[PDB]
Short mmCIF file of N, CA, C and O in Angstrom, two decimals:
data_model
loop_
_atom_site.label_atom_id
_atom_site.label_comp_id
_atom_site.label_asym_id
_atom_site.label_seq_id
_atom_site.Cartn_x
_atom_site.Cartn_y
_atom_site.Cartn_z
N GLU A 1 -92.36 -7.31 72.06
CA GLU A 1 -93.30 -8.23 71.94
C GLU A 1 -93.55 -7.40 70.89
O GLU A 1 -94.86 -8.11 69.98
N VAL A 2 -93.74 -6.49 70.42
CA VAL A 2 -93.85 -5.46 68.96
C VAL A 2 -92.95 -5.54 67.97
O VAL A 2 -93.11 -5.14 66.89
N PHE A 3 -91.69 -5.78 68.48
CA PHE A 3 -90.44 -5.96 67.65
C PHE A 3 -90.09 -7.24 67.48
O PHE A 3 -89.36 -7.60 66.21
N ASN A 4 -90.33 -8.16 68.49
CA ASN A 4 -89.80 -9.82 68.06
C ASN A 4 -90.96 -10.39 68.29
O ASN A 4 -90.70 -11.61 68.14
N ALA A 5 -92.10 -10.12 67.21
CA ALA A 5 -93.11 -10.76 67.43
C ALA A 5 -93.33 -11.87 66.24
O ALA A 5 -92.15 -11.28 65.38
N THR A 6 -94.06 -13.17 66.35
CA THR A 6 -93.65 -13.62 65.42
C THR A 6 -94.19 -13.60 64.05
O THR A 6 -93.50 -13.49 62.99
N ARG A 7 -95.84 -12.77 64.04
CA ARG A 7 -96.46 -12.52 62.76
C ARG A 7 -97.31 -11.30 63.03
O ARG A 7 -97.13 -10.48 63.90
N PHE A 8 -97.17 -9.92 62.06
CA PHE A 8 -97.31 -9.04 61.59
C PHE A 8 -98.80 -9.03 60.84
O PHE A 8 -98.67 -10.10 59.99
N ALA A 9 -99.26 -7.61 60.51
CA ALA A 9 -100.51 -7.72 59.98
C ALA A 9 -99.65 -6.98 58.43
O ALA A 9 -98.86 -6.69 58.27
N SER A 10 -100.64 -6.74 57.57
CA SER A 10 -100.36 -6.21 56.33
C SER A 10 -100.02 -4.85 56.28
O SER A 10 -100.35 -4.20 57.50
N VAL A 11 -100.12 -4.29 55.37
CA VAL A 11 -99.83 -2.69 55.33
C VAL A 11 -101.00 -1.64 54.86
O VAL A 11 -101.10 -0.81 55.71
N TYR A 12 -101.80 -2.53 54.31
CA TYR A 12 -103.22 -1.80 54.22
C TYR A 12 -104.15 -2.04 55.83
O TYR A 12 -104.54 -1.02 56.12
N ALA A 13 -103.81 -2.94 56.44
CA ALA A 13 -104.40 -3.17 57.70
C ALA A 13 -103.15 -3.20 58.58
O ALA A 13 -102.85 -4.85 58.77
N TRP A 14 -102.56 -2.48 59.41
CA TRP A 14 -101.70 -2.33 60.22
C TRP A 14 -101.89 -2.62 61.64
O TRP A 14 -102.81 -1.82 61.60
N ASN A 15 -101.03 -2.88 62.16
CA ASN A 15 -101.53 -3.17 63.75
C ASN A 15 -100.77 -1.92 64.53
O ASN A 15 -100.08 -1.62 64.14
N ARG A 16 -102.09 -1.55 65.36
CA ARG A 16 -101.66 -0.57 66.37
C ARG A 16 -101.59 -0.77 67.45
O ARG A 16 -102.57 -1.09 68.18
N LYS A 17 -100.65 -0.71 68.18
CA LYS A 17 -100.48 -0.63 69.77
C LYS A 17 -99.91 0.61 70.18
O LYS A 17 -99.01 1.13 70.36
N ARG A 18 -101.16 1.05 70.97
CA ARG A 18 -100.87 2.36 72.09
C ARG A 18 -99.83 1.89 73.17
O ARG A 18 -100.19 1.12 74.08
N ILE A 19 -98.50 2.25 73.34
CA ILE A 19 -97.64 2.20 73.99
C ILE A 19 -97.34 3.29 75.23
O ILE A 19 -97.55 4.38 74.66
N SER A 20 -97.75 3.31 76.40
CA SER A 20 -97.65 4.34 77.56
C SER A 20 -97.48 3.56 78.66
O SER A 20 -97.72 2.52 78.86
N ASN A 21 -97.12 4.50 80.14
CA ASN A 21 -97.32 3.78 81.15
C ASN A 21 -96.05 3.05 81.35
O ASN A 21 -96.15 1.81 81.87
N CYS A 22 -94.71 3.53 80.60
CA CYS A 22 -93.46 2.63 80.89
C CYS A 22 -92.61 3.44 80.78
O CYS A 22 -92.68 4.46 80.56
N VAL A 23 -91.55 2.57 80.55
CA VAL A 23 -89.83 3.47 80.39
C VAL A 23 -89.32 3.16 79.09
O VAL A 23 -89.40 1.90 78.47
N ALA A 24 -89.28 4.25 78.08
CA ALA A 24 -89.08 4.21 76.51
C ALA A 24 -87.32 4.52 76.59
O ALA A 24 -86.82 5.62 76.96
N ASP A 25 -86.29 3.53 76.33
CA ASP A 25 -85.26 3.59 76.48
C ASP A 25 -84.70 3.40 74.92
O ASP A 25 -83.72 4.55 74.98
N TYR A 26 -85.08 2.66 73.91
CA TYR A 26 -84.65 2.56 72.76
C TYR A 26 -83.30 2.19 72.37
O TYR A 26 -82.97 2.27 71.46
N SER A 27 -82.44 1.91 73.55
CA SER A 27 -81.04 1.61 73.30
C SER A 27 -81.14 0.31 72.41
O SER A 27 -79.91 0.02 71.63
N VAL A 28 -81.62 -0.56 72.69
CA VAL A 28 -81.98 -1.96 72.12
C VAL A 28 -82.15 -1.79 70.42
O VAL A 28 -81.46 -2.36 69.66
N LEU A 29 -82.70 -0.59 70.00
CA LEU A 29 -82.74 -0.34 68.79
C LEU A 29 -81.83 0.39 68.18
O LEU A 29 -81.24 0.33 66.84
N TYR A 30 -81.04 0.93 69.28
CA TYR A 30 -79.42 1.69 68.62
C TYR A 30 -78.65 0.57 68.68
O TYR A 30 -77.94 0.62 67.55
N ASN A 31 -78.55 -0.38 69.54
CA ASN A 31 -77.23 -1.20 69.62
C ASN A 31 -77.73 -2.76 68.49
O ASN A 31 -76.58 -3.01 67.98
N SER A 32 -78.62 -3.00 68.48
CA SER A 32 -78.62 -4.17 67.73
C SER A 32 -78.90 -4.30 66.37
O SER A 32 -79.10 -3.28 65.80
N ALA A 33 -78.01 -5.15 65.87
CA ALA A 33 -77.78 -5.43 64.28
C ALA A 33 -79.00 -6.30 63.54
O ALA A 33 -78.79 -5.96 62.27
N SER A 34 -80.15 -6.64 64.22
CA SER A 34 -81.12 -6.98 63.49
C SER A 34 -81.74 -6.10 62.55
O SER A 34 -82.60 -6.61 61.81
N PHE A 35 -81.81 -4.86 62.62
CA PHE A 35 -82.53 -4.06 61.69
C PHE A 35 -82.00 -3.64 60.78
O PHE A 35 -80.75 -3.12 60.70
N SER A 36 -82.41 -3.62 59.60
CA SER A 36 -81.70 -2.92 58.27
C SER A 36 -82.07 -1.29 57.87
O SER A 36 -81.27 -1.02 57.51
N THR A 37 -83.03 -0.54 58.48
CA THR A 37 -83.02 0.56 58.34
C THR A 37 -84.01 1.04 59.97
O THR A 37 -84.74 0.72 60.53
N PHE A 38 -83.15 2.40 59.84
CA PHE A 38 -83.60 3.22 61.26
C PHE A 38 -83.41 4.53 61.01
O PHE A 38 -82.19 4.97 61.28
N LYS A 39 -84.51 5.26 61.16
CA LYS A 39 -84.51 6.53 60.96
C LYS A 39 -85.34 7.71 61.60
O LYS A 39 -86.55 7.13 61.49
N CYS A 40 -85.18 8.26 62.44
CA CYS A 40 -85.95 9.30 62.91
C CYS A 40 -85.75 10.72 62.03
O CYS A 40 -84.83 11.02 61.69
N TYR A 41 -86.88 11.56 62.04
CA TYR A 41 -87.17 12.51 61.34
C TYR A 41 -87.59 13.82 62.45
O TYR A 41 -86.81 14.78 62.15
N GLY A 42 -88.36 13.38 63.18
CA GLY A 42 -89.07 14.64 63.66
C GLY A 42 -87.93 15.06 65.10
O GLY A 42 -88.19 16.44 65.29
N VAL A 43 -87.71 13.95 65.38
CA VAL A 43 -86.77 13.84 67.05
C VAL A 43 -85.21 13.36 66.87
O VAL A 43 -85.07 12.43 66.02
N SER A 44 -84.15 14.07 67.17
CA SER A 44 -83.14 13.42 67.47
C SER A 44 -82.93 12.21 67.76
O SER A 44 -83.68 11.95 69.05
N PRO A 45 -82.26 11.21 67.28
CA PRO A 45 -82.32 9.93 67.93
C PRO A 45 -82.12 9.60 69.16
O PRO A 45 -82.19 8.84 70.22
N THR A 46 -80.53 10.59 69.83
CA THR A 46 -80.09 10.37 71.09
C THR A 46 -80.88 10.99 72.05
O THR A 46 -80.44 10.89 73.22
N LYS A 47 -81.87 11.83 71.67
CA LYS A 47 -82.31 12.60 72.77
C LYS A 47 -83.65 11.75 73.23
O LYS A 47 -84.90 12.40 72.68
N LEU A 48 -84.09 10.74 73.18
CA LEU A 48 -84.90 9.96 73.68
C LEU A 48 -85.09 9.23 74.95
O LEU A 48 -86.05 8.87 75.42
N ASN A 49 -83.87 8.61 75.47
CA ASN A 49 -83.73 8.11 76.61
C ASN A 49 -84.05 9.09 77.78
O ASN A 49 -83.95 8.73 78.93
N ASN B 1 -111.65 2.95 72.92
CA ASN B 1 -110.43 4.20 72.66
C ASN B 1 -109.89 4.10 74.37
O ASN B 1 -110.07 4.96 75.46
N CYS B 2 -109.43 2.94 74.69
CA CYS B 2 -108.55 2.92 75.97
C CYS B 2 -107.27 3.66 76.17
O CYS B 2 -106.65 3.40 75.34
N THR B 3 -106.74 4.19 77.09
CA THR B 3 -105.68 5.01 77.28
C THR B 3 -104.73 3.90 78.63
O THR B 3 -103.41 4.49 78.60
N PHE B 4 -105.44 3.54 79.09
CA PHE B 4 -104.96 2.97 80.56
C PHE B 4 -105.52 1.69 81.26
O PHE B 4 -106.58 1.72 81.03
N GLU B 5 -104.60 0.97 81.36
CA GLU B 5 -105.42 -0.46 82.17
C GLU B 5 -104.53 -1.14 82.97
O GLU B 5 -103.11 -1.29 82.53
N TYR B 6 -104.60 -1.61 84.53
CA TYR B 6 -104.13 -2.27 85.36
C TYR B 6 -105.08 -3.15 85.91
O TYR B 6 -106.34 -2.98 86.49
N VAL B 7 -104.55 -4.22 86.29
CA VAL B 7 -105.31 -5.25 86.95
C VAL B 7 -104.22 -5.80 88.12
O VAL B 7 -103.34 -6.25 87.90
N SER B 8 -104.69 -5.85 89.12
CA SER B 8 -104.15 -6.17 90.33
C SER B 8 -103.89 -7.62 90.86
O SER B 8 -102.93 -8.53 91.42
N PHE B 9 -121.70 -3.73 111.35
CA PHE B 9 -120.68 -4.05 110.48
C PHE B 9 -119.47 -4.45 110.62
O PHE B 9 -119.37 -4.23 111.90
N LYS B 10 -118.62 -4.92 110.05
CA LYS B 10 -117.36 -5.10 110.49
C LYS B 10 -116.17 -4.34 109.97
O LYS B 10 -115.21 -4.14 110.91
N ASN B 11 -116.40 -3.75 108.91
CA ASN B 11 -115.17 -2.83 108.26
C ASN B 11 -115.68 -1.65 107.57
O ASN B 11 -116.49 -1.42 107.31
N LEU B 12 -114.81 -0.61 108.18
CA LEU B 12 -114.92 0.85 107.82
C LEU B 12 -113.79 1.09 106.76
O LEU B 12 -112.78 1.03 107.27
N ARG B 13 -114.51 1.37 105.39
CA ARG B 13 -113.56 2.04 104.58
C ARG B 13 -113.68 3.35 104.21
O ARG B 13 -114.71 3.32 103.71
N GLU B 14 -112.69 3.95 104.15
CA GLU B 14 -112.73 5.54 103.94
C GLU B 14 -111.62 5.99 102.13
O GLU B 14 -110.87 5.45 102.26
N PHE B 15 -112.61 6.61 101.59
CA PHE B 15 -111.71 6.83 100.56
C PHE B 15 -111.86 8.53 99.74
O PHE B 15 -112.95 8.85 100.44
N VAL B 16 -111.09 8.70 99.16
CA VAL B 16 -110.78 10.47 99.10
C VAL B 16 -110.58 10.53 97.78
O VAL B 16 -109.32 10.12 97.12
N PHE B 17 -111.39 11.23 96.86
CA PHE B 17 -111.20 10.82 95.32
C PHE B 17 -111.05 12.68 94.85
O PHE B 17 -111.93 13.07 95.14
#
């Protein structure tokens, strides 16, 4: 609902959604080809699930 | 600044917090 949402806000006024109390898997971010760029900087991508 | 949110005589109800 934050990645497949219909409308987003601008870059100067961006939407801030606090995600907590759930399961962070991120595998849909690795396998899906709908993304053009996917870069993790502070943490290795595979050590998240 | 919300960090969590959840939404679901005759009687004696005891509680411990």
